Amino acid sequence: NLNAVRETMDVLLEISRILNTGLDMETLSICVRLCEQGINPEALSSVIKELRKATEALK
């Protein structure tokens, strides 16, 4: 199965690359596995945009 769940995870990177989302390969597997738990994705759109916001105040 791990061969299938690798391909399905590899295709999903491209549709996140042309949609111009800042999610790299590591943060994607984190968010995919976290969405795979059952958390509502309308909220995750806010934590990433805020974690990236407080990260910019440091630099």
Partner: protein
């Protein structure tokens, strides 16, 4: 490990170099912002509404690719519903393009002047990039070369 998957997420977005207390404070911003929405429509349609806006400003084949993958991703729905939210947050050849001079059976077209007009803009942007560099390279260093003694220097700030 939902209590840990938020701890590994907070590490990736942390830029590499106190790196031991910031992670403790950034995990607050992750929780302080996660429960604001929780206190307070199909999936593929939201892609097409972004597929439309692609084709309008050119770049047709890319839009024909975005729909090509979501068709094979069917044979997970809540994951693409997360990517469409961050669509605008990201950071800002092939000779077998139009090339009516190569092919097996190329159809009769007559002059276009609408491919050569978007083949000189492919070059005009090149000469306008390598010119902003020389505007953003002589400026970044002349702003320090000519200033008060000891402004841009970090060792004098000690």
């Amino acid at each position: 490990s939902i209590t840990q998957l938020f701890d590994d997420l907070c590490e990736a977005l942390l830029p590499a170099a106190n790196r031991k207390r910031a992670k403790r404070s950034l995990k607050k911003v992750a929780y302080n912002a996660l429960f604001t929405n929780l206190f307070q429509l199909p999936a593929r349609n939201k892609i097409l509404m972004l597929s439309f806006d692609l084709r309008v400003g050119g770049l047709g084949p890319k839009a024909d690719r975005l729909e090509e993958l979501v068709e094979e991703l069917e044979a997970v729905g809540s994951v693409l519903d997360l990517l469409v939210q961050l669509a605008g947050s990201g950071p800002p050849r092939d000779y077998f393009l139009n090339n009516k001079h190569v092919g097996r059976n190329v159809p009769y077209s007559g002059y276009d002047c609408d491919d050569l007009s978007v083949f000189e803009m492919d070059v005009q942007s090149l000469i306008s990039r390598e010119e902003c560099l020389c505007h953003s390279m002589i400026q970044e260093t002349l702003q320090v070369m000519e200033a008060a003694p000891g402004t841009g220097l970090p060792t004098v700030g000690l």
